[PDB]
C-alpha cells in the first residue's frame, strides 16, 4: 500500500486495541460521599419508569427542585423533558444546570428485557443533545437496579466513538462529539463498577468494529488488533493465513476470500481460566468484508445490510475479551472468519472440498457467509486442544432473519431445548433479546440437495424457513467429535439501528457465561 | 346468474354438504375375524418405521411371504418397493396381490410430530399408483398413533375434488379415488367412528381448498354451512351484505362491497350438553381472489391465492368434528366471508366494527381488515364471552420464509395457549412453530397521520407474520382478557398435489386436552 | 349508497363547509392592553433568528426571565429549546408555564423566502408536542414581521385539522387534538388580522380536502362543499354532470370518470368584483380520484403520491374562496375537474378532446393532464369572458421531485412576465416556485401519434417531463386565448411526513396582490 | 390482427368467388376488468376442462 494509508490504517488498529470506554458506574450513597451533592457537568439526566420517578429517593437527589417535580409530571411515556435549575452547584461552574427526565415504560412481552433498556437508550440519546461543551461528564441518574442491561444500553446510546467527522480521521477516527456519562444506580451495583466497565467497553468496541468502514477494518487490521489484545491481555492467538488455509483443507474460507487484495484469515484466539472450567465453549464469528446476499430481499436490500456485516465477528470477539476481563470461569475459543469476498459469476456453480470433508456447490456467489461458517464450525469442534460442550457461532447471515424475528430480536437455530432456554434467559435479562427460529433438520436438508456435490450453499426454495435452512448447512460441517448444544444466532438486524452499530451480542455472550 | 350456472353451484353445494370420506379403520385382530384371510383387493400396503418392518408380528400378517421379506430389505428410507404375491385369496379375484412396502423414518425434531405422518402420506400415495380398478385397499400400518396416521391417510392419494375425464357433470366428484382401509396393529385408542369423522374433516377441508373462486363463493360456502347447520342440528347467524355497513362492520363490509355475491359474516354456534370444558371463539378469513403482501414478488401472491379458504375451511371442518365427536366444548366459528374484485380503496380510512379506524395504505393486504371485525364480533357481539379465540388465515407470505412449508406460525398472547397448540400440532401431525410476540415493537410499524392505524407494516423486515397477526388482536373487545391465538397457515395449507387439509385435526386434538 | 355512508358523508360536507381557523392574529402592544401580562395558557412559543431574539425587545415581553435569557443562548439554529417559568400567569392557571424558544436560520437563498417559514412551521410544529391540556390557547410569539408567510406557516402547523383518531370519525372527522393559536407580531400587521384569518383558513381547508381520504372527499362531496360555499358567500356555480359531459363534447374527462360510481364533474366557479378588475384571471385544478401515475418512478411510489391527487383542485378552490373573503380586485373563474379514475381499460383509446383535437390513450395512468386540457379550454372558450392569464394547478408528475424538488412547485409558462411575478408570489408568501423549461419546438415531438392528433404521454421520459405534461395542457388552450398561461406541477410541495401541507392557495392570493 | 385478418380473408373469397367452401368464426369477446378470474375452473365446449 502507500505510505499514508498504511500509516492510517496502523493509527486505526492502535485506536481499537486501546480503546477504552467514556462510560463510568457509581451509586447514590458513594456519588453522595465522593461528589459531595456538586454534579459533575451543566446537564444531568433523570431515567425511570412512571412508578420509579414518583418514589421518595428521587426527592432526596441533589438536582430535584419544583421545576424538576413538574417535568415528572409533564413528561410523555418514552419520552423527555428537560428544564432548567439556576445556581445548581456543578464542576463546570455553568449559571444554569439543565435536568431532562426520561419515562421509560413498564409495558414489557415476554419475550423482551423487563428493564426496557432500548427505551433507555432512546431517552439518553435524546438528552444527550443538548450537551453544551465536549469535555464534559454528563451524570446519568437511573432508577432501575438492572446493572447489566443499563450498563449495555448506556454504552450503546449518545454519538458513537467511531466518527471521520470534522477532522476525526486525523486523530484515528475517535470522535470528539462523545461525553463521558457516569450512571448512577440507587443501590451498589450487584456487578462490581470495574465489570461493567469492561462490558461497557466491549459494547462501544464491537460497536467501533461494526461502525469502521471496510477500507479501515480490513481483514488484516481486525487479525493485528486481535494480535494486540492477546499481546496486551496475554491470551493465545493462531492464524492460518493465506494460501495455508487451502494447503491445509480450508477450502471454504479460502475459495470466498483468494480474490482479494489482502488473504483470508482463520484468527481463532483461546482463554483457558485458573481452577476446573465450569463449561468449555467454543466461539465462531462471520466476519467478511463486502459480502452481504440472499434471495429473501432485493439486491438494494442487502446492500444497505452489508454495512454491519462484520457484526458477528466483532460479538464474538469481544464477548472473548469480556471473559478475559472478567475471568469468567469458562475454557473459551473464538475463531474469526475473516476474509473479502473481492471482484457475481465469478465462483458460480464452483464445487469446493470444506474442512470437514463435505463437498459444496456454489450455487450463488452471494451466499457464500455459511461457507466461512462451516470451516470455522469444524475447526472449533475438530482441530483445537480441547472438544467444546457448546458451540455458538454468530453472524449477520440472513434477510430472513428480519422478516422471521424482526429488528430487535436476534434468531437462534439450535439443537438442544436446555441451551435455546439459557440463550433466550442470557437475551432477556442482558437487554439484546433473541428468539427461537424453526429447529427441524429433516425439512431443511431436501433444501440443499445438489446433483453432483454433497450440498449447495443456498436453499432451493426461499419460503421454507430462511433463517433455519442456513443455520442447518452450518450443522452439516459439525465435527463427529462434538456432541453438545450447537447455538446458531443469526443477528443480521439488531447489530444497528438508524444511528449505525449498535454493540449487539457481547453482552448477550456474557450474560450466557455467568449463569453457565 | 344464469341457469347453467346456477345448477352448477347447487350440485357442488350438494356435493360438500353431503361428502362422505372414503377410509375406514380397524386392527389387525378384528380384521382377522371379520375377513378371515381374504384381501379386500388386488393391492395392499405395508407402511413402518426400520424397526417395525422387523417386528415378529409382522411375518404373521396375511400377505406375508418370502417375496415382502425381501422388499423389507431392499427398501430405502423414505421410499417404495413391490412385490407381487401369486395366489393369494382376495375379494377381487385378481391373478397376483401387489404388497408394496414403505419406510418411515424415526428421526423427528423435537418441533416435529414423532410419527413423520408426512412421510406416511407421501408413501401411501406413491403405492397407489399402482391401483388396477378405481376397490379397497388395504393399508396395513405398523404405527399406533391413530389420530395423525388417520389424517395422514385422508389427505394421501387422488384429491376427492376433481374437474378431470367429465368429473364436472358429477358435481366435481373424483371418480379416480379409491377406497381404503386403514388396520392399526392393536384396537385405536379412538373409536374407528370418530377417526372417520376426522378424516371426513380433513377430505372435507381438502375439497373447499382444492375447489375454485367460481365454484366455492361467498355465497356457496355459506349455503354448505347453512347445510351442515339443519343436518347435525346447530344455530347459524348471518349478516350480509349492506346490514354490515349499518350495524357497523365497515372492514369486511369496505373489502367485500365491489363483488357480484355480497360479503357475509357467518356465525355458527355449537354448545354441548352439560358443562363446556372451555368456551372457544374460532374465527377464519375466507376472502376470494384475494392474497398480497411485501414480502414476496407479485407473482408468489398469485400463486398463494389459490388456497385463501385455507383459514375459513380449517375452523369450519373443525367445528363439524367437534358436533360429531360432541366435544365437550361451547364452540363458535364466525367464517369471515367475502370476495375482493374489481388502486380501487387506496388510501381509504374505514371505521371498523371495533370502532378504531384503519388506513387502507394497501388493498392487497385486507385479509386481517375482515379478520379484525371478526375477532371483534366473536368477543363482544355473541351470548358468552369466550376464554380462547383462535383465528386461523393464509396471511402472510412471510410465514414461509419464517416458519416453512410445514409448521403453522402460531402468534399468541399466553405461554400456555402457545405450548397447548404446539402440543397438538405434533400429537395430530398438523405442526405448528411460534412467531415472535412482542406488541411493543410491532405497534410503531402501524402508526398513521389520520387513522388509528394503519393496514399494513410500514418496514418489510421486522417480524411480518407477528406484525399481522397484532393488527388482528387490536380488534379485540376490551370485555375480552383471555388467550388470543393467532394461526398463520399461509403455506402448510397446501403442496405440489393440492390442498391439505391442515387446520381441523390440529383443532380436534387441541379440544381434547383442553 | 347505505344511509351509514350518507349521513358520514354529509357530515363530512357541513365540516369542510362550516370550517373555522383555529388561528388568530395580534400585536405586542395589542396583547398587552388586552391581556394585562397574563399569559393565554401553560404554553407559549417565542420564534424569531440568532439577532431576532437578541434584541432589547425580547426582554420587554411578559414571559422573559433568565430561563428564557438561558434558553436563547443553548438553543440550536433550526430546533427548540424550552423551559419552565414558576408562578407565571397565566389563564388555564398552570403552576408552571412552559416557554419554548425557535431559532429560525437567516440563510435563505435566491430562489426561496427570505423569512424561511418551512423552519417556523416546525418550530411551532416542535413546540406543540408539549401541550397538556388540547382545549387551550398557545401564545406564539413571532419576532418576524412577514405577516402573510407567518400566517400560512402557522396555519400549517401542529396537529391536523382533519383526524379519524380516537373517535372523530362520529365527529365529522374534526379533530380534538388542535390548539388555538394566538400569533403575536411584534409591530401592527400590515394586513389586517381578519384578512390573515381568512388567508390561514383557506391553507388549513384546503389541507383538509388533501388529507381526506378518497371515500370522503369524492366528486359528489366536493361539488357539494363548492354548492355550500357558493351559498353562504354568494358567487355562481356551474356544474356539467355525468353523460352531459359527453353530449357537450368533453369526451377527455368523461372518458376518464365514465367507469366510476359516482359521475365526473366539471365545476366552474364565477367570482366577478365591484368596479374595474385589475386582471381577468382563470383558475384550473386538477381533482381526480384514485389517479396518480407515471413512467419517472416506481409503481410503488406513485401509489404513495395518489394520496394527494386532490391537491391542485384543492389549490384553487381555496385561492379561489380567499379572493371573495378579502373581496380582491380580480375577475376569478375556478374549474375544478373532477372525476373518479377506477389498467388494460380504455388503453389506446382516442378520445376526442372538447378542443377538437384528438388524443391517444398510450398511458391510462396519465389521465390527469386529459381532463386538465378540457378544463383550460373551458376556461378559455366556453365563460362569459376571456382570461388575461390562465392558471392551471395539479399534482402531475413524479419528475416535479426529481426537477425542483419538494418544497418548490414547478412552472411551465410562456411568457417570462407571468413567470417572474408567480416565483415572487412564491417567495413572498412562502409557498415557493422554481422554472421548468418553456421549449414547445422540443416538446412536441414527444407526443407524435399513428392515427390521432397526440398522444397523451412522452415517448422518451428522459426529455423535461415536467415540461412536456404543461406543454400537452397548452394545446387544448382557446384560439381565442392569447394571454399568459402559467401550470404549476404542485406533486410534491402539497404534502409532507405529516400530511398534506396546503400548499397552493397563499401563492394565488400574494399573485392577485401584486397584479 | 386474427379476427381482422380471417374476416378480410374470408371477404375476398366472397368477391373473386373462389372454389372454396368456407366458415368464418369470429372469436369476439371484450376482456374487463388480474386477480379476476384467477384459478377459476372452466368447462370448454369441447368438454374439456381449463
Ligand atoms: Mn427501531
Ligand atoms: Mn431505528
Ligand atoms: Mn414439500
Ligand atoms: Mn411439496
Ligand atoms: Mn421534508
Ligand atoms: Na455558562
Ligand atoms: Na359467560
Do not use: W
Not at 22 to 27: I, Q
Not at 351 to 371: F, L, P, Q
Amino acid at each position: 500500500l502507500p505510505k499514508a494509508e498504511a500509516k492510517e490504517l496502523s493509527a486505526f488498529v492502535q485506536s481499537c486495541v486501546e480503546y477504552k470506554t467514556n462510560v463510568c458506574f457509581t451509586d447514590v450513597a458513594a456519588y453522595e460521599s465522593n461528589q459531595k451533592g456538586v454534579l459533575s457537568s451543566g446537564l444531568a439526566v433523570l431515567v425511570g419508569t412512571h412508578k420509579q420517578l414518583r418514589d421518595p429517593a428521587v426527592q432526596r437527589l441533589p438536582f430535584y427542585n419544583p421545576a424538576v417535580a413538574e417535568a415528572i409530571e409533564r413528561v410523555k411515556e418514552g419520552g423527555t423533558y428537560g428544564v432548567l435549575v439556576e445556581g445548581l452547584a456543578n464542576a463546570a461552574g455553568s449559571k444554569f444546570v439543565r435536568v431532562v427526565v426520561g419515562e421509560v415504560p413498564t409495558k414489557a412481552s415476554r419475550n423482551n428485557c423487563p428493564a426496557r433498556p432500548d427505551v433507555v437508550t432512546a431517552l439518553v440519546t435524546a438528552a444527550l443533545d443538548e450537551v453544551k461543551e465536549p469535555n464534559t461528564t454528563v451524570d446519568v441518574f437511573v432508577l432501575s437496579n438492572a446493572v447489566l442491561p443499563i450498563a449495555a444500553a448506556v454504552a450503546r446510546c449518545g454519538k458513537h466513538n467511531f466518527s471521520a467527522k470534522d477532522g476525526a480521521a486525523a486523530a484515528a477516527y475517535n470522535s470528539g462529539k462523545v461525553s463521558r456519562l457516569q450512571v448512577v444506580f440507587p443501590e451498589p451495583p450487584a456487578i462490581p463498577p470495574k465489570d461493567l466497565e469492561a462490558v461497557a467497553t466491549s459494547t462501544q468496541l464491537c460497536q467501533r468494529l461494526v461502525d469502521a468502514p471496510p477500507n479501515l477494518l480490513t481483514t488484516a487490521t481486525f487479525t493485528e488488533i486481535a494480535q494486540g489484545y492477546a499481546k496486551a491481555l496475554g491470551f493465545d492467538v493462531d492464524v492460518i493465513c493465506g494460501d495455508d488455509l487451502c494447503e491445509r483443507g480450508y477450502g471454504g474460507i479460502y475459495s470466498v476470500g483468494k480474490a482479494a487484495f489482502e488473504a483470508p484469515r482463520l484468527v481463532t484466539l483461546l482463554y483457558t481460566p485458573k481452577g476446573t472450567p465450569v463449561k468449555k465453549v467454543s466461539l465462531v464469528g462471520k466476519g467478511i468484508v463486502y459480502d452481504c446476499g440472499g434471495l429473501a430481499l432485493k439486491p438494494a436490500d442487502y446492500m444497505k445490510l452489508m454495512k454491519h456485516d462484520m457484526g458477528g465477528a466483532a460479538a464474538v470477539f469481544c464477548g472473548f475479551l469480556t471473559a478475559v476481563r472478567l475471568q469468567q470461569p469458562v475454557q473459551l475459543s473464538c475463531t474469526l472468519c475473516l476474509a473479502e469476498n473481492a471482484i457475481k459469476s465469478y465462483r458460480n456453480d464452483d464445487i469446493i472440498v470444506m474442512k470437514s470433508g463435505k463437498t459444496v456447490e456454489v450455487i450463488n456467489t452471494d451466499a457464500e457467509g455459511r461457507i466461512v461458517l462451516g470451516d470455522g464450525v469444524f475447526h472449533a469442534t475438530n482441530e483445537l486442544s480441547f472438544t467444546p460442550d457448546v458451540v455458538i457461532d454468530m453472524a449477520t447471515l440472513t434477510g430472513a432473519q428480519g422478516i422471521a424475528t424482526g429488528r430487535h430480536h436476534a434468531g437462534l437455530y439450535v439443537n438442544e431445548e436446555g441451551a435455546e432456554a439459557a440463550m433466550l434467559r442470557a437475551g432477556r435479562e442482558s437487554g439484546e433479546t433473541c428468539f427461537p427460529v424453526l429447529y427441524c433438520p429433516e425439512y431443511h436438508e431436501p433444501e440443499f440437495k445438489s446433483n453432483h456435490a454433497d450440498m449447495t450453499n443456498l436453499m432451493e426454495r426461499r419460503d421454507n424457513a430462511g433463517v433455519s435452512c442456513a443455520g442447518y448447512f452450518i450443522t452439516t460441517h459439525l465435527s463427529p467429535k462434538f456432541t453438545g448444544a450447537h447455538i446458531h444466532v443469526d443477528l443480521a438486524y439488531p447489530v444497528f439501528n438508524s444511528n449505525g452499530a449498535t454493540g449487539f451480542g457481547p453482552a448477550l455472550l456474557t450474560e450466557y457465561f455467568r449463569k453457565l
